[PDB]
Amino acid sequence: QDVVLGLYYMTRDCVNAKGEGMVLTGPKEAERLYRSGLASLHARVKVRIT
Amino acid sequence: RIRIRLKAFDHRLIDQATAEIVETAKRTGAQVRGPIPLPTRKERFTVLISPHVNKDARDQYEIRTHLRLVDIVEPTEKTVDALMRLDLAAGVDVQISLG
Amino acid sequence: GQKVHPNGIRLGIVKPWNSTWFANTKEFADNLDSDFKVRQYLTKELAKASVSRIVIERPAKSIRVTIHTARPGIVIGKKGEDVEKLRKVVADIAGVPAQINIAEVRKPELDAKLVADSITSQLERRVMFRRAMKRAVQNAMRLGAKGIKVEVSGRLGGAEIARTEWYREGRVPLHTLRADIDYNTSEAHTTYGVIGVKVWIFKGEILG
Amino acid sequence: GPEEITADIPNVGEAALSKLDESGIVYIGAEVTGGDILVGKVTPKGSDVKDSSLRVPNGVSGTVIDVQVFTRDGVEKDKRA
Amino acid sequence: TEFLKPRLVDIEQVSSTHAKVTLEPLERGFGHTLGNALRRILLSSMPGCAVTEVEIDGVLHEYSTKEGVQEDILEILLNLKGLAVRVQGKDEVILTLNKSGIGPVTAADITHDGDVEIVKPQHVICHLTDENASISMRIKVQRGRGYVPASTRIHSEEDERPIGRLLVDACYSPVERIAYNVEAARVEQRTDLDKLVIEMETNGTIDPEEAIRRAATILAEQLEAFVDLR
Amino acid sequence: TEFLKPRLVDIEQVSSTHAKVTLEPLERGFGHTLGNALRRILLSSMPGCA
Amino acid sequence: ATILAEQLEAFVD
Amino acid sequence: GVLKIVKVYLAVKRRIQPGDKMAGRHGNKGVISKINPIEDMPYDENGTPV
Amino acid sequence: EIKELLKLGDLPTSGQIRLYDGRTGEQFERPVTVGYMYMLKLNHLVDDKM
Amino acid sequence: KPLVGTGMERAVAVDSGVTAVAKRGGVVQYVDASRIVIKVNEDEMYPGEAGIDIYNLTKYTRSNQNTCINQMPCVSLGEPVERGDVLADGPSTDLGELAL
C-alpha cells in the first residue's frame, strides 16, 4: 500500500514542472537533479538510458 | 579583604574545597587573591601497644592538619553572600574573616 | 602479637576512615566519645540486621551517619518508620541534628565483617566450627574474592586446651599496601568461653 | 505441620533476607523487580526444607504500595502486631 | 576555491528564553546544510542540568500523599522534572527547599548555594494549605545529555545509594525548539550569498552563542574522522 | 559529556571509480547528519572543471 | 569534509 | 479456614514502547512502531515538531 | 465553521501546513495535514503479551 | 480534556460515580491531605446537625482491570462550590469532564 503510492507519485508526469524538456545524460544525473533542487520528480525529459 | 582559613586532615579534600571556594569567588566578584598553602601541623603521638608491659613496643601516630589561606580582595554585594548557601564538603573546617 | 592491623596500615592509601570530620583539640575528644556512643547504640540495635560499617560524618553542628548494611529492608522497616526512629535517638546521643543514610551492601559474602559475624553466630548455635569456616571461605571464593583467609581461636569444640585454626584460599597479601584487604573481627560468647574470629578478604590491588 | 512466615529462607543465601524485615515479609516501598522475595513463607519437613515464599513474577517491577495482613491470629514476631 | 567564512554578526535577545541569532555570510547552497546540521545537533546533544533524585522527609514511596499540600507526590515530581537549573562549577549539587505556612511554594524559596542559579522564580511546586504543615525536600541535580530514564538508571547507578530516594526521570536537553531560515544576504558587492537566521528556544539556562559554539565543535570533531583518516 | 569517535572500517573498492565507505559507530541520529551534510556538499559545492 | 571543516573553522573552541 | 493471609500490592508504571496499541475515537487502530527522536520528526516552518 | 474558526486563529484555511523533514531539512512537496487528534492508549500492552 | 468533544463528557463523568460530586453547596476548609472539608451554606443546611461535609478521597488503589483508580481535588482552599458541582477528579477526568 505505501510503496505503490510512492511509485505512483514518482513515475508520473505533469505538463509543467522544474526542468521541463531538458536533456539528461543518464539516470544518475536525473537523481542528482532531483536531489539538488533543479528539477521535479515528475517533469518530462529526454534521458539516455541503456 | 576576606581572609579564608581552610583546615582539614585529608589534603586532597582540602584542595578540592579550596578550588570550589575559588570558583564561587571568581564568578561573582573579581581579583581573588589565591590559594596560599600555610605550614601543615603534624601533631604526633607515641603510645605503648602492649596491654600490660613492653615499653620498647610502640606505635607512633600523627594527625596532619593542613592549612589553606584563600583571600578575597574586593568583597562585592553578590560574592560574600554566595558562600552562605555554598556550604563545603564535610571534614573541612573553613574560617572566613573580613578585615 | 606479631602482625600489624590490615585496615590501620592502609588508611592513608587504599582504605578510608570511618569517622570523617575535622575538629580542634577542644572538641575532638567529645566528638570521639559521641561517635563511640552512637556506634555502640547502632550495634546494639541492628544486631539482627546484617550491618558492616557505620560511617560518621559531621559538618556544621549536624551529624550524618551512613549505615552500610546487607539488608536495608530490616533496618528501614516500613518506608521511613524505623530509620526515622533511629535518627532521633542518634541525635539525642550526639546532642545535635541527626541524619541517617543507609548504604546497601552488594555481596555480603565478600564483606569480611559480615562473614565474621555470621561465623560467630554459627558458633553460638553449636555448629562444627570447621564446617562454618569452610563455608565462609568457599562462599567468598565463589563470589569472586581474589582471596580470603579466616581464623578462629580458643575453646574450639569446648576443648580444655585452647587452639587456633585457620583456612586460607586464593592469595591474601598483607605486606602489599596497595592490596584491598578487607579485614575484620568478631567474638563468639559460647558456653565454654569466647571464640575469636578473624577474617581477611582480598578484593584486589588498586593501581594509582 | 503448618508452613511458616520467616526470613530464615534456606539453601538460597544473602539473596533472600533483603527487601524484608528480621521476622519476614517485604518491608514496603522499594524498587522490586522479577525474582525478588516479598513474603518468606516456607515449612520444614515439606535437610528437607523448600522455597514456596511468594516471590515477584517474571518480568514485572514496581513499588510495594500497601501490605495487608488479617493473618492467622498470631502473626507478630515478639511485637509488631 | 573562492569560498568564504561566516561569523556571528548580530545576536538579538527577544526575551530571556526565546532568542534568535544570525550567521553571515554563508556560501551558495550551504545555508540549508548548516541549518539542518546545527538543528539536529542542537536538538540532540546539548548539555543541561536537571533534577535526578528527590528526597522528601517522612515519605515511603512516590504514590503516597502528604500532610498540608495540594499537589500529590507524583504531581510534585512532575513539577520538579520541569525545573530549570544552571550550575557553574560543579557537575553534581544538592539543593534544599524548606518552607512552612499557607500559600504556594515557588521555586524562589529554595535555599540556593553560590554556584547554582534558579532561573525561574515563578515555577510553582506545591500549594501548602495547612499552617502547621511543613515540607523539606533535598533535590539532587546532575548534568548530562539526551534522555536517561528511571528504568535504565535502576541498575546503572553504581554508587550504592540508600533506600528512600525517589528517582525522577532526567530530561537533560535544555533546547526545546529551533528553526533556521535562509534569507537573502545584503552583501554590497555579492548577490549570491545568504544568511542563516537560527531561532532558538531554550530552557533559559543555556547561552545561545555558547550553544552554537559547542554544536560547531561537536560537528567539527565528528568530521575529523573523515578529514584525517581517509 | 564525551562523544563516540568512529573508525573507518572499510573501503570496499568495487572498481577504480567506485567505493563503499562502511563506517561505524556514531551517536544516535548522527549518521544522517554526516551523510546529508556530505551529500549536499558533494552534489552542489565541490569544485572542478568541465 | 575539509570544505565543511574550513567553513565551520571560525567559531569553534 | 485460611491461616496466613498476606496481600502485597505492587504498582508497575508502564510508559509506552514499540509494540503498544493506541487508537483514536474513530476506529483507527494502531500499533506504535518506532519511537523517533525529536529531531527526525516532521517540523513545520514555525519550528514545532509534530 | 471549521474554516471560519481556522481563520480566527492565524492558521491556513485548508487545514494543511507545509512541513519540512527532520532528516533532510527539505520541504515535503504537496502540503500535509497537521492537527490535534485525541488519541487513547488501550490496555493491550506489549509487555503483557510478550 | 478532549479538545474536540461532544459535550456529553460532563454527564458521563458525573453520572458514573468516579468523581466526588458535592452533596451540599457552600465554601471549603480544605484540610484535603486526607479529606475535602466543605462548609455548607445556611440555606442548604439543616437546623440541627450544624454540619460540614467531609469527602473521602480514594487514593491509589486497584481497579478490576489492574488500572489505577485515583481521585485528586480540583478545588482550591476557600472557594465556592454549588450543589451538584464536582470536587475531586477521578480516573480519566479533568475538571469534571471525561479525559480517556
From Swiss-Prot, chain C:
Alphabetized Pfam families for the sequence: KH_2 (PF07650), Ribosomal_S3_C (PF00189)
Listed InterPro entries: KH_dom (IPR004087), KH_dom-like_a/b (IPR015946), KH_dom_type_2 (IPR004044), KH_sf_prok-type (IPR009019), Ribosomal_S3_C_sf (IPR036419), Ribosomal_uS3_bac-typ (IPR005704), Ribosomal_uS3_C (IPR001351), Ribosomal_uS3_CS (IPR018280)
UniProt KW Ribonucleoprotein keyword: yes
Gene: rpsC
GO terms, molecular function: mRNA binding; rRNA binding; structural constituent of ribosome
Organism, as annotated: Escherichia coli O45:K1 (strain S88 / ExPEC)
The protein's name in its UniProt record: Small ribosomal subunit protein uS3
Record-annotated disulphide pairs: none
Gene Ontology terms describing biological process: translation
Matches recorded under PROSITE patterns: KH_TYPE_2, RIBOSOMAL_S3
Keywords, sorted A to Z: Ribonucleoprotein, Ribosomal protein, RNA-binding, rRNA-binding
Coiled coil: none
Sequence similarity: Belongs to the universal ribosomal protein uS3 family.
Domain (KH type-2) ranges: 38-106
HAMAP family: Ribosomal_uS3_B
Curated annotation (Swiss-Prot), chain I:
Similarity remark: Belongs to the RNA polymerase beta chain family.
Name of the protein: DNA-directed RNA polymerase subunit beta
Oligomeric and partner information: The RNAP catalytic core consists of 2 alpha, 1 beta, 1 beta' and 1 omega subunit. When a sigma factor is associated with the core the holoenzyme is formed, which can initiate transcription.
Modification type N6-acetyllysine: residues: K7
Function text: DNA-dependent RNA polymerase catalyzes the transcription of DNA into RNA using the four ribonucleoside triphosphates as substrates.
Protein's gene: rpoB
Lineage per the UniProt record: Bacteria, Pseudomonadati, Pseudomonadota, Gammaproteobacteria, Enterobacterales
Curated annotation (Swiss-Prot), chain J:
Signal peptide: none
Function: DNA-dependent RNA polymerase catalyzes the transcription of DNA into RNA using the four ribonucleoside triphosphates as substrates.
Binding partners and assembly: The RNAP catalytic core consists of 2 alpha, 1 beta, 1 beta' and 1 omega subunit. When a sigma factor is associated with the core the holoenzyme is formed, which can initiate transcription.
Family, similarity comment: Belongs to the RNA polymerase beta chain family.
Protein name: DNA-directed RNA polymerase subunit beta
